[PDB]
Amino acid sequence: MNIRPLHDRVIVKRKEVETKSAGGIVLTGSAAAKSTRGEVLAVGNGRILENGEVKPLDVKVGDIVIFNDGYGVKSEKIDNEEVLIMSESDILAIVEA
Amino acid sequence: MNIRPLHDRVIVKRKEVETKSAGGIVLTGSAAAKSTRGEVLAVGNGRILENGEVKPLDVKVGDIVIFNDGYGVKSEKIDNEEVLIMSESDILAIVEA
């Protein structure tokens, strides 16, 4: 089954644990560090705060995103796959172009 | 590929680790200190806070800025280049003239 994040929470999936390429030709062996990029899988209707109306989120289903990996984020398992649940407050940018 | 900061976040690049000149003729060797100046590469649409409307940021793409280097700021890598991601809350001034 798939997931449905509650208003303002966003469901994303992590990317590569130090993709062995950085710098150029040199395949940097894992230096004890994690990835901050991720694919957005689902979106909550949007933040309700301050009563009057409910604003959408500025990320769509399937965007590529740099987030801030911190306390806001949680680790979960869907069909046995590594997925994260943070709020848009934690999403920083979108890698495009 | 290039980057697209999420509303209110700003993407900047750092400048010189104690440019060897300060004082005058003397090339001050690195004293264990970093730079607070930087070039603005991308801008988020702007802060959404308090529902009603969404105000732009007062920094444009390509400004030179003094920011406050602190917790608000994060370190990332684009095409293999050292770029930082803080919100306008952390930008203090713009060096012009």
């Binding site: - | 300060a22 004082g23 005058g24 003729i25 003397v26 060797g29 004293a31 264990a32």
Partner: protein, 150 residues
């Protein structure tokens, strides 16, 4: 001397006069020294640095000797002074200096023999009221380093 900041106003007044500089301080540690070393290396300003003579109380008095011989002004935080507020004028001067692995030597100081002879006439009576045998050796040494030879 730990912070190079303390030096800058001075080091640069010297870079403008185009003359080299000796630094005799209580000590020159990591942060300051390193940078001095980097600055002298690149052909910026010709400089050298070397510990002060002896320790304890005589250091200050003996560093004063050095002041007198070269017509400079001792910069201590005791009279409430800062390195930063020191123009070229405070600096001593000589015609040549020579320093080894463990030996600094100043040749021919700018100090007028009016002031040289005077400071010598003071350490003249230091020995007269030196009520000890060890407090007598050092004074006679200094007298020789300022008057005759060793």
């Amino acid at each position: 001397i730990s912070n190079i900041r303390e030096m800058l106003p001075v080091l640069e007044a010297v870079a403008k006069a185009g003359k080299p500089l000796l630094i005799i301080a209580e000590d020159v540690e990591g942060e300051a020294l390193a940078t001095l070393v980097v600055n002298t290396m690149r052909g910026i300003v010709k400089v050298a640095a070397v510990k002060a003579p002896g320790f304890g109380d005589r250091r200050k008095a003996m560093l004063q000797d050095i002041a007198t011989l070269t017509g400079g002004t001792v910069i201590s935080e005791e009279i409430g002074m800062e390195l930063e507020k020191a123009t070229l004028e405070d600096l001593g001067q000589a015609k040549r200096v020579v320093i080894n692995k463990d030996t600094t030597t100043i040749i021919d100081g700018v100090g007028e023999e009016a002031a040289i002879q005077g400071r010598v006439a003071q350490i003249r009576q230091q020995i007269e009221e030196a009520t000890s045998d060890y407090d007598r050796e050092k004074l006679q040494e200094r007298v020789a380093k300022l008057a005759g030879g060793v």
